[PDB]
Chain A
Amino acid sequence: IVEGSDAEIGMSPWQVMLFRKSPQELLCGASLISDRWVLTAAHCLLYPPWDKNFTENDLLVRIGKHSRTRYERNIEKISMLEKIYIHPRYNWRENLDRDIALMKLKKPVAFSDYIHPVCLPDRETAASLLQAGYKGRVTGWGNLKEGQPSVLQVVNLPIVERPVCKDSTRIRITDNMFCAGYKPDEGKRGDACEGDSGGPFVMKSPFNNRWYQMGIVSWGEGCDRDGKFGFYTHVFRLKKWIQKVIDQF
């Protein structure tokens, strides 16, 4: 996260950290959507161009973690994966279309003051909140500049018009993504950055006071560059697949 601020404790209890098991290495962000399900970016797990293709066994996840250096003993939880699920039509070859994956926990995690799931958008919450100019919130332990934080970083960024997103890059954008961030005219800055993928882009519903995850940090070009915008996986657009893997046989 570039130009973000330090998260207050318990401010993003659905925050999850995807680590490489051997050796220990923080790979990406993720989010808690249930006691056994963690949502993240497909490319965090599978991306051949970078010689990336992990297996459940290769990784683990940390939750309720407030410090990367210290170990809030009875606060954070470390959970192993039981199965990874990557969207069938994830396009890593071209534009990272459908950059989404689900990770089922070996064992359920216990909710606490520091750990809780974020809500997934329903049809109408999404129809109302997904409007350019409306701000969402992005969190992550990723790069501080195009630089590693000791506290989870957070940044509130406005959703940007599709045409503006499209014209801001040569990469082919799809309906399955959306971009957010300030325009050079706007004054403020801020952006997600390498390392933050998988982390959540959330919005608070005025209707019920609850936080909903509308996007997944997916990609960008550089970080916090004027005229550029960070891209996110459109969670609602991919809700059917999420439910499918979740409710199965």
Chain B
Amino acid sequence: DCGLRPLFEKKSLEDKTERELLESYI
């Protein structure tokens, strides 16, 4: 049980800036 957040990943919900992270991977 690591790297997955109950109020986010477990809920299939993105926090507000993580897409900034995934986009940087391009």
Contact = CB atoms under 8 A, between A and B. Distances in A.
Contacts of B26: 133
Contacts of B4: 116, 209-211
B7 A136 contact: no
Nearest to B2: A119
Interface in B1-26: 1-9, 15-18, 20-22, 24-26
A11 B7 CA distance: 8
A206 B25 contact: yes
A195 interface: no
Interface string A130-142: 0001111100000
B17 A211 contact: no
B6 A204 contact: no
Nearest to A205: B3
B3 A11 contact: no
Interface string A200-243: 00011110111110000000000000000000000000000000
Contact of A118 (B3, B8, B25): B3
5 contacts: A8-B16, A33-B2, A135-B24, A137-B17, A203-B21
Interface of B: 1-9, 15-18, 20-22, 24-26
Which 5 residue pairs are nearest across A and B when measured between Cβ atoms? A210-B3, A10-B7, A119-B3, A135-B24, A119-B2
